Amino acid sequence: FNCIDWVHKLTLEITDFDGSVSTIDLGASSSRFTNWGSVSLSLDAEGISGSNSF
Amino acid sequence: TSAEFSFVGESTTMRENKCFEQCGGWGCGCFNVNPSCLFVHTYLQSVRKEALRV
Amino acid sequence: EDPHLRNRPGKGHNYIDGMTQEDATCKPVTYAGACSSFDVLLEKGKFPLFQSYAHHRTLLEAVHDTIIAKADPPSCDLQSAHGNPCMKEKLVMKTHCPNDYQSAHYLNNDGKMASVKCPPKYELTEDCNFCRQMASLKKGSYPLQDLFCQSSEDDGSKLKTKMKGVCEVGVQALKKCDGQLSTAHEVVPFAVFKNSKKVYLDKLDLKTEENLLPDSFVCFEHKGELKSFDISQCPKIGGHGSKKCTGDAAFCSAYECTAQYANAYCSHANGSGIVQIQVSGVWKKPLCVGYERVVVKRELS
Amino acid sequence: EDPHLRNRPGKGHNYIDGMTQEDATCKPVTYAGACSSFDVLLEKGKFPLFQSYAHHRTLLEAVHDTIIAKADPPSCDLQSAHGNPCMKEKLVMKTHCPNDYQSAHYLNNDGKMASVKCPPKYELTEDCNFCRQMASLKKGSYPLQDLFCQSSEDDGSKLKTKMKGVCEVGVQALKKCDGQLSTAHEVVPFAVFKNSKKVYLDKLDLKTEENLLPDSFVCFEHKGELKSFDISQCPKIGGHGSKKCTGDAAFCSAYECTAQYANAYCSHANGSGIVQIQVSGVWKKPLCVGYERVVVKRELS
Amino acid sequence: PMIDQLECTTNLIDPFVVFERGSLPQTRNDKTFAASKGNRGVQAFSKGSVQADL
């Protein structure tokens, strides 16, 4: 396969208030679903451009 | 022609009919959770008692 | 869907206490006969979830197979004086019911067996919320839900309904909302675990696998149509039994294929046995999972 | 031009011990009489190889011509006690038995000729394993392979099954696989040589050469298309014999043509000759090459 | 084709040669491409800091 847009993914776990731990991720500006709300990313970081020739 | 404006008449007047989607439920003034209908019957009329031939 | 529509494994009993006026056709349930408590389950466009998984048992079949217990009373009287216990659990359910019906069973909060019954000779209405006076009256009940039951041994008592921002969903009451209240007609599925209550969920992630239990294999004999054969008579590997059995690799990999001494050709089922659900991220096998149509009261303030 | 599909060269016998009750019509095999062990061999869309190789011997004709050895016992009973030796090498044979037929033969992995049958009153099933109850019982032998045989005496004991990715096909243990086994059925041709076993081959190359053999011409009888005629009664070149025959240049160039003094207009058969297979890149003379469905245990881990 | 013989040869490109020629981790410009530590898919390792808001 090939890459067209490198998404800044951050492996972020979520430890709830009771004690349960849920491991998820966040990329660019995506959202997830948890047992208490929704987590999302507001700002990315860096970014590799020009990957169509690989 | 809207259902709430068919009793007015079909006179020769530059008129138009619009319908905007609004809110529903008991919080707005309805008994159903489905959105309500906003029947708008706009007609244009004259203002000045004289005209100009451009 | 599933090809086995009328064939029911095991006992296949669909009769409740107080409405045993149809045991001539609903006991057992075969291709012939007009069972009023099973014909509406195979209707197109009504209960598709039951048509997706049809190789497992139903609610009443689970009650008769010592899987789901009964409530008290198991069959409420929807006409008796001084009120009745089965009233608030029915008025909160928005389900349509055809005419010429006398009973309508559903699932309560404790996961037991709650149902209503009209005294003879009364019938139901469009919303089947009350019995009215009087074609031919159906001698059975009407499934108020679209659920299917099976045999599972996975505990789930601590997995209570975690629906946030909802006052009273379905029948259960999460809290006592004293401020605002938003009543809407929304569809929410439900799931029942071992030693738990009617747990409601948002999404329904099913799972289809197989196992070694006899409920995952079918057999049929050859004689001069289709004739079913018992599955509990196939001997095990190195054990004992009754009549010999044989089949393909899927059947020989579980039991003992004798081939030359067999009496009926067995085949593998079309994906049945263990049906797990995805709850709390992990995979657990529920007992009686479904997809009903009730009224959900969410929050506002 | 077009050769017939019923003119059996050589003896033309299709019967076996124990099920030889059809000797009144299958000995020999001609237009008169419906041989049960030959009607299914000419079904369109079932055995294309046997229809492509018309003037060629079969397994039974090879047995009667002292070409393929016989098993012991050649006719194993299915409903007999003390087990059944003719089941361990046949259970991994994916076959299909229709109806009416009571017995069925197959080419075992030992290069011999085995067969099974049901005692009265029983018939075959759909898996060709046990026996069931039913109309009429065709006392014969239903063929389960699409093989063609011929007369050859080429030794080939230094050639065995050397397939790639196959641990144990049928009952012959090939290479030692310490991992798991992939028990599954597929398609694969094979070829049996003289003084050897049933050698399985993944690929094969057929070669047909035209010669001046008596089994390479068809004759149309007439008064003096149309019907067939016995070619063994035609005289040879430079001599005489029983009756008289004539034909085109292909028939007159080998035998003697009497033109108007003949009784059958012969021609060249388009579908005969000596068929040779290419094994290990070396052209050899096979005996019976077939194409069935067996259970190949490939690799996995 | 050789009358009776049939020698068929294909000049197929073996992907294992390219897979074993330049396999990750590899050094490309200032970044370092490597494998993943969770979900399936190729990732990239940077040498900068973390500037993001959750």
PDB file of C-alpha atoms in Angstrom, chain D residues 74-280:
ATOM      1  CA  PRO D  74     -13.429 -57.856  -4.287  1.00  0.00           C
ATOM      2  CA  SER D  75     -16.996 -57.263  -3.009  1.00  0.00           C
ATOM      3  CA  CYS D  76     -17.073 -56.140   0.629  1.00  0.00           C
ATOM      4  CA  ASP D  77     -20.353 -56.148   2.547  1.00  0.00           C
ATOM      5  CA  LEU D  78     -21.511 -52.925   4.193  1.00  0.00           C
ATOM      6  CA  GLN D  79     -23.924 -54.390   6.772  1.00  0.00           C
ATOM      7  CA  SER D  80     -21.559 -57.180   7.869  1.00  0.00           C
ATOM      8  CA  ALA D  81     -20.110 -57.628  11.346  1.00  0.00           C
ATOM      9  CA  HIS D  82     -16.431 -57.614  12.373  1.00  0.00           C
ATOM     10  CA  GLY D  83     -15.917 -54.254  10.688  1.00  0.00           C
ATOM     11  CA  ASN D  84     -15.397 -53.691   6.982  1.00  0.00           C
ATOM     12  CA  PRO D  85     -11.982 -53.543   5.258  1.00  0.00           C
ATOM     13  CA  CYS D  86     -13.500 -51.758   2.226  1.00  0.00           C
ATOM     14  CA  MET D  87     -14.272 -48.560   4.165  1.00  0.00           C
ATOM     15  CA  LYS D  88     -10.921 -47.264   5.422  1.00  0.00           C
ATOM     16  CA  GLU D  89      -9.772 -46.563   1.845  1.00  0.00           C
ATOM     17  CA  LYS D  90     -13.218 -45.388   0.673  1.00  0.00           C
ATOM     18  CA  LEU D  91     -14.289 -42.985   3.449  1.00  0.00           C
ATOM     19  CA  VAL D  92     -11.845 -40.335   2.168  1.00  0.00           C
ATOM     20  CA  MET D  93     -13.335 -40.723  -1.328  1.00  0.00           C
ATOM     21  CA  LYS D  94     -15.779 -37.885  -2.043  1.00  0.00           C
ATOM     22  CA  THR D  95     -18.345 -39.579  -4.293  1.00  0.00           C
ATOM     23  CA  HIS D  96     -22.065 -39.181  -5.004  1.00  0.00           C
ATOM     24  CA  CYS D  97     -24.600 -41.988  -5.476  1.00  0.00           C
ATOM     25  CA  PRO D  98     -27.962 -41.141  -7.096  1.00  0.00           C
ATOM     26  CA  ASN D  99     -30.757 -43.685  -6.618  1.00  0.00           C
ATOM     27  CA  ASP D 100     -31.795 -47.222  -7.606  1.00  0.00           C
ATOM     28  CA  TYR D 101     -28.175 -48.420  -7.702  1.00  0.00           C
ATOM     29  CA  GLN D 102     -27.351 -50.898  -4.928  1.00  0.00           C
ATOM     30  CA  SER D 103     -23.607 -51.518  -5.382  1.00  0.00           C
ATOM     31  CA  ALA D 104     -20.690 -49.242  -6.220  1.00  0.00           C
ATOM     32  CA  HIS D 105     -17.017 -49.848  -7.000  1.00  0.00           C
ATOM     33  CA  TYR D 106     -13.930 -47.659  -6.752  1.00  0.00           C
ATOM     34  CA  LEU D 107     -10.205 -47.726  -7.506  1.00  0.00           C
ATOM     35  CA  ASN D 108      -8.393 -48.242  -4.207  1.00  0.00           C
ATOM     36  CA  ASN D 109      -4.960 -46.848  -3.355  1.00  0.00           C
ATOM     37  CA  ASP D 110      -3.433 -50.357  -3.519  1.00  0.00           C
ATOM     38  CA  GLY D 111      -3.870 -50.598  -7.297  1.00  0.00           C
ATOM     39  CA  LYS D 112      -6.443 -53.398  -7.005  1.00  0.00           C
ATOM     40  CA  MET D 113     -10.230 -53.281  -7.561  1.00  0.00           C
ATOM     41  CA  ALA D 114     -12.620 -53.121  -4.600  1.00  0.00           C
ATOM     42  CA  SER D 115     -16.392 -52.743  -4.452  1.00  0.00           C
ATOM     43  CA  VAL D 116     -19.153 -52.419  -1.861  1.00  0.00           C
ATOM     44  CA  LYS D 117     -22.801 -53.453  -1.894  1.00  0.00           C
ATOM     45  CA  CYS D 118     -25.893 -53.461   0.304  1.00  0.00           C
ATOM     46  CA  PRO D 119     -27.610 -56.731   1.248  1.00  0.00           C
ATOM     47  CA  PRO D 120     -31.288 -57.148   0.329  1.00  0.00           C
ATOM     48  CA  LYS D 121     -33.228 -55.210   0.780  1.00  0.00           C
ATOM     49  CA  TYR D 122     -31.140 -52.032   0.896  1.00  0.00           C
ATOM     50  CA  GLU D 123     -29.640 -49.461  -1.466  1.00  0.00           C
ATOM     51  CA  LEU D 124     -26.980 -46.755  -1.479  1.00  0.00           C
ATOM     52  CA  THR D 125     -27.253 -43.332   0.161  1.00  0.00           C
ATOM     53  CA  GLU D 126     -26.147 -39.840  -0.877  1.00  0.00           C
ATOM     54  CA  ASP D 127     -22.668 -40.171   0.670  1.00  0.00           C
ATOM     55  CA  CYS D 128     -22.138 -43.715  -0.710  1.00  0.00           C
ATOM     56  CA  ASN D 129     -21.391 -44.985   2.801  1.00  0.00           C
ATOM     57  CA  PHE D 130     -24.094 -46.878   4.737  1.00  0.00           C
ATOM     58  CA  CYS D 131     -27.345 -48.355   3.393  1.00  0.00           C
ATOM     59  CA  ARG D 132     -30.936 -47.117   3.532  1.00  0.00           C
ATOM     60  CA  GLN D 133     -34.440 -48.264   2.624  1.00  0.00           C
ATOM     61  CA  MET D 134     -36.569 -47.140  -0.312  1.00  0.00           C
ATOM     62  CA  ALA D 135     -37.738 -48.281  -6.163  1.00  0.00           C
ATOM     63  CA  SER D 136     -36.126 -51.101  -8.131  1.00  0.00           C
ATOM     64  CA  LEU D 137     -32.632 -52.334  -7.262  1.00  0.00           C
ATOM     65  CA  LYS D 138     -30.306 -52.336 -10.281  1.00  0.00           C
ATOM     66  CA  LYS D 139     -28.116 -55.406  -9.699  1.00  0.00           C
ATOM     67  CA  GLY D 140     -24.861 -53.977 -10.993  1.00  0.00           C
ATOM     68  CA  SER D 141     -22.157 -51.534  -9.941  1.00  0.00           C
ATOM     69  CA  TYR D 142     -22.371 -47.746 -10.086  1.00  0.00           C
ATOM     70  CA  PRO D 143     -19.045 -46.234 -11.229  1.00  0.00           C
ATOM     71  CA  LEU D 144     -17.627 -43.501  -9.003  1.00  0.00           C
ATOM     72  CA  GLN D 145     -14.676 -42.357 -11.148  1.00  0.00           C
ATOM     73  CA  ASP D 146     -14.062 -40.890 -14.593  1.00  0.00           C
ATOM     74  CA  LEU D 147     -11.147 -43.104 -15.647  1.00  0.00           C
ATOM     75  CA  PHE D 148     -10.068 -44.704 -18.922  1.00  0.00           C
ATOM     76  CA  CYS D 149      -8.035 -47.895 -19.276  1.00  0.00           C
ATOM     77  CA  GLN D 150      -6.051 -49.578 -22.041  1.00  0.00           C
ATOM     78  CA  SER D 151      -3.729 -52.519 -22.684  1.00  0.00           C
ATOM     79  CA  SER D 152      -0.157 -51.891 -21.538  1.00  0.00           C
ATOM     80  CA  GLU D 153       2.661 -53.719 -19.752  1.00  0.00           C
ATOM     81  CA  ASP D 154       5.066 -50.901 -18.868  1.00  0.00           C
ATOM     82  CA  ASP D 155       6.785 -51.294 -15.503  1.00  0.00           C
ATOM     83  CA  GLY D 156       6.799 -48.278 -13.207  1.00  0.00           C
ATOM     84  CA  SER D 157       7.722 -49.244  -9.651  1.00  0.00           C
ATOM     85  CA  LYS D 158      10.317 -46.448  -9.359  1.00  0.00           C
ATOM     86  CA  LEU D 159       7.645 -43.713  -9.561  1.00  0.00           C
ATOM     87  CA  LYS D 160       5.542 -42.658  -6.567  1.00  0.00           C
ATOM     88  CA  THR D 161       3.363 -39.733  -5.523  1.00  0.00           C
ATOM     89  CA  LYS D 162       5.632 -36.692  -5.094  1.00  0.00           C
ATOM     90  CA  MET D 163       3.152 -33.838  -4.746  1.00  0.00           C
ATOM     91  CA  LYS D 164       4.158 -30.453  -3.338  1.00  0.00           C
ATOM     92  CA  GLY D 165       2.483 -29.440  -0.092  1.00  0.00           C
ATOM     93  CA  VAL D 166       0.744 -32.796   0.453  1.00  0.00           C
ATOM     94  CA  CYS D 167       1.419 -34.743   3.652  1.00  0.00           C
ATOM     95  CA  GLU D 168      -0.919 -37.738   3.280  1.00  0.00           C
ATOM     96  CA  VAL D 169      -3.461 -38.148   0.467  1.00  0.00           C
ATOM     97  CA  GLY D 170      -6.026 -40.925   0.808  1.00  0.00           C
ATOM     98  CA  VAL D 171      -4.452 -43.660   2.931  1.00  0.00           C
ATOM     99  CA  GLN D 172      -0.842 -43.619   1.668  1.00  0.00           C
ATOM    100  CA  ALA D 173       1.512 -41.826   4.067  1.00  0.00           C
ATOM    101  CA  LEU D 174       3.825 -39.699   1.918  1.00  0.00           C
ATOM    102  CA  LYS D 175       6.226 -37.360   3.722  1.00  0.00           C
ATOM    103  CA  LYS D 176       6.471 -37.063   7.505  1.00  0.00           C
ATOM    104  CA  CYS D 177       4.771 -33.831   8.623  1.00  0.00           C
ATOM    105  CA  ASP D 178       5.396 -32.930  12.267  1.00  0.00           C
ATOM    106  CA  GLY D 179       2.866 -30.072  12.135  1.00  0.00           C
ATOM    107  CA  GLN D 180      -0.897 -30.050  11.746  1.00  0.00           C
ATOM    108  CA  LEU D 181      -3.006 -31.430   8.890  1.00  0.00           C
ATOM    109  CA  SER D 182      -5.462 -29.630   6.599  1.00  0.00           C
ATOM    110  CA  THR D 183      -8.211 -32.216   6.089  1.00  0.00           C
ATOM    111  CA  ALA D 184     -10.092 -30.951   3.034  1.00  0.00           C
ATOM    112  CA  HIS D 185     -11.426 -32.284  -0.263  1.00  0.00           C
ATOM    113  CA  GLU D 186     -10.250 -30.983  -3.635  1.00  0.00           C
ATOM    114  CA  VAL D 187      -9.668 -32.071  -7.243  1.00  0.00           C
ATOM    115  CA  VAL D 188      -6.519 -33.880  -8.393  1.00  0.00           C
ATOM    116  CA  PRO D 189      -5.815 -36.389 -11.198  1.00  0.00           C
ATOM    117  CA  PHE D 190      -3.920 -39.648 -10.766  1.00  0.00           C
ATOM    118  CA  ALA D 191      -2.320 -42.465 -12.744  1.00  0.00           C
ATOM    119  CA  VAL D 192      -1.815 -46.137 -11.866  1.00  0.00           C
ATOM    120  CA  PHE D 193       1.146 -48.009 -13.347  1.00  0.00           C
ATOM    121  CA  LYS D 194       2.026 -51.700 -13.529  1.00  0.00           C
ATOM    122  CA  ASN D 195       3.392 -53.385 -10.389  1.00  0.00           C
ATOM    123  CA  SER D 196       2.964 -50.188  -8.363  1.00  0.00           C
ATOM    124  CA  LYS D 197       0.380 -48.258  -6.337  1.00  0.00           C
ATOM    125  CA  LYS D 198      -2.138 -45.505  -7.087  1.00  0.00           C
ATOM    126  CA  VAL D 199       0.299 -42.693  -7.886  1.00  0.00           C
ATOM    127  CA  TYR D 200      -1.271 -39.243  -7.544  1.00  0.00           C
ATOM    128  CA  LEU D 201      -0.106 -36.403  -9.792  1.00  0.00           C
ATOM    129  CA  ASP D 202      -0.880 -32.692  -9.642  1.00  0.00           C
ATOM    130  CA  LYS D 203      -0.460 -32.077 -13.386  1.00  0.00           C
ATOM    131  CA  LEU D 204      -0.609 -34.396 -16.384  1.00  0.00           C
ATOM    132  CA  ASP D 205       0.037 -34.244 -20.128  1.00  0.00           C
ATOM    133  CA  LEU D 206      -1.990 -36.460 -22.461  1.00  0.00           C
ATOM    134  CA  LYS D 207      -0.642 -37.522 -25.857  1.00  0.00           C
ATOM    135  CA  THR D 208      -2.684 -39.210 -28.595  1.00  0.00           C
ATOM    136  CA  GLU D 209      -1.084 -40.854 -31.635  1.00  0.00           C
ATOM    137  CA  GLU D 210      -2.902 -42.435 -34.573  1.00  0.00           C
ATOM    138  CA  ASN D 211      -1.897 -45.926 -35.690  1.00  0.00           C
ATOM    139  CA  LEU D 212      -3.357 -48.808 -37.728  1.00  0.00           C
ATOM    140  CA  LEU D 213      -4.933 -50.634 -34.788  1.00  0.00           C
ATOM    141  CA  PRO D 214      -8.284 -52.407 -35.293  1.00  0.00           C
ATOM    142  CA  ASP D 215      -9.738 -50.362 -32.400  1.00  0.00           C
ATOM    143  CA  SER D 216      -9.433 -47.082 -34.348  1.00  0.00           C
ATOM    144  CA  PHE D 217     -12.216 -47.405 -36.950  1.00  0.00           C
ATOM    145  CA  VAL D 218     -16.020 -47.265 -36.853  1.00  0.00           C
ATOM    146  CA  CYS D 219     -18.375 -49.027 -39.271  1.00  0.00           C
ATOM    147  CA  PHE D 220     -21.948 -48.227 -40.336  1.00  0.00           C
ATOM    148  CA  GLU D 221     -23.983 -51.279 -41.316  1.00  0.00           C
ATOM    149  CA  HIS D 222     -26.402 -51.198 -44.247  1.00  0.00           C
ATOM    150  CA  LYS D 223     -28.115 -53.435 -46.796  1.00  0.00           C
ATOM    151  CA  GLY D 224     -26.192 -55.143 -49.582  1.00  0.00           C
ATOM    152  CA  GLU D 225     -26.601 -41.686 -39.139  1.00  0.00           C
ATOM    153  CA  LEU D 226     -27.047 -45.452 -39.431  1.00  0.00           C
ATOM    154  CA  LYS D 227     -26.427 -48.194 -36.863  1.00  0.00           C
ATOM    155  CA  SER D 228     -23.134 -49.677 -35.692  1.00  0.00           C
ATOM    156  CA  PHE D 229     -21.482 -52.871 -36.908  1.00  0.00           C
ATOM    157  CA  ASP D 230     -18.982 -55.356 -35.514  1.00  0.00           C
ATOM    158  CA  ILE D 231     -15.533 -54.463 -36.838  1.00  0.00           C
ATOM    159  CA  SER D 232     -13.988 -57.819 -35.862  1.00  0.00           C
ATOM    160  CA  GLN D 233     -15.865 -59.465 -38.757  1.00  0.00           C
ATOM    161  CA  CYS D 234     -14.203 -57.263 -41.382  1.00  0.00           C
ATOM    162  CA  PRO D 235     -11.487 -59.007 -43.428  1.00  0.00           C
ATOM    163  CA  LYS D 236      -7.852 -57.946 -43.391  1.00  0.00           C
ATOM    164  CA  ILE D 237      -5.729 -56.698 -46.291  1.00  0.00           C
ATOM    165  CA  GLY D 238      -4.424 -59.304 -48.712  1.00  0.00           C
ATOM    166  CA  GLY D 239      -6.859 -61.917 -47.421  1.00  0.00           C
ATOM    167  CA  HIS D 240     -10.480 -62.821 -46.696  1.00  0.00           C
ATOM    168  CA  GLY D 241     -12.602 -63.755 -43.690  1.00  0.00           C
ATOM    169  CA  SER D 242     -16.218 -63.783 -42.520  1.00  0.00           C
ATOM    170  CA  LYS D 243     -18.239 -60.919 -44.000  1.00  0.00           C
ATOM    171  CA  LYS D 244     -17.067 -58.013 -46.163  1.00  0.00           C
ATOM    172  CA  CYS D 245     -16.399 -54.368 -45.326  1.00  0.00           C
ATOM    173  CA  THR D 246     -15.511 -51.192 -47.203  1.00  0.00           C
ATOM    174  CA  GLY D 247     -14.717 -47.575 -46.495  1.00  0.00           C
ATOM    175  CA  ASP D 248     -12.684 -44.541 -47.474  1.00  0.00           C
ATOM    176  CA  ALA D 249      -8.897 -44.330 -47.891  1.00  0.00           C
ATOM    177  CA  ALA D 250      -8.320 -44.642 -44.135  1.00  0.00           C
ATOM    178  CA  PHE D 251     -10.151 -47.989 -44.047  1.00  0.00           C
ATOM    179  CA  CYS D 252      -9.038 -49.308 -47.448  1.00  0.00           C
ATOM    180  CA  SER D 253      -5.395 -48.460 -46.665  1.00  0.00           C
ATOM    181  CA  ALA D 254      -5.407 -50.935 -43.742  1.00  0.00           C
ATOM    182  CA  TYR D 255      -7.946 -53.647 -44.640  1.00  0.00           C
ATOM    183  CA  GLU D 256      -9.521 -54.966 -47.856  1.00  0.00           C
ATOM    184  CA  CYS D 257     -12.429 -53.121 -49.483  1.00  0.00           C
ATOM    185  CA  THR D 258     -14.875 -54.982 -51.731  1.00  0.00           C
ATOM    186  CA  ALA D 259     -16.888 -51.879 -52.746  1.00  0.00           C
ATOM    187  CA  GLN D 260     -20.272 -53.210 -53.879  1.00  0.00           C
ATOM    188  CA  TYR D 261     -19.635 -56.668 -52.374  1.00  0.00           C
ATOM    189  CA  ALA D 262     -19.525 -55.282 -48.813  1.00  0.00           C
ATOM    190  CA  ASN D 263     -22.247 -54.941 -46.180  1.00  0.00           C
ATOM    191  CA  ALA D 264     -21.028 -52.078 -43.950  1.00  0.00           C
ATOM    192  CA  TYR D 265     -19.616 -48.665 -44.883  1.00  0.00           C
ATOM    193  CA  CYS D 266     -16.698 -48.213 -42.490  1.00  0.00           C
ATOM    194  CA  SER D 267     -14.766 -45.027 -41.737  1.00  0.00           C
ATOM    195  CA  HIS D 268     -12.085 -43.615 -39.444  1.00  0.00           C
ATOM    196  CA  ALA D 269     -12.826 -43.202 -35.738  1.00  0.00           C
ATOM    197  CA  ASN D 270     -12.101 -39.681 -34.458  1.00  0.00           C
ATOM    198  CA  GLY D 271     -11.300 -40.558 -30.862  1.00  0.00           C
ATOM    199  CA  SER D 272      -8.969 -43.476 -30.164  1.00  0.00           C
ATOM    200  CA  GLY D 273      -5.289 -44.376 -30.432  1.00  0.00           C
ATOM    201  CA  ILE D 274      -2.759 -44.957 -27.677  1.00  0.00           C
ATOM    202  CA  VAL D 275      -2.923 -42.443 -24.817  1.00  0.00           C
ATOM    203  CA  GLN D 276       0.310 -41.795 -22.907  1.00  0.00           C
ATOM    204  CA  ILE D 277       0.912 -39.661 -19.824  1.00  0.00           C
ATOM    205  CA  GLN D 278       3.952 -37.531 -18.969  1.00  0.00           C
ATOM    206  CA  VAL D 279       5.131 -38.163 -15.397  1.00  0.00           C
ATOM    207  CA  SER D 280       8.353 -36.643 -14.010  1.00  0.00           C
TER     208      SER D 280
END
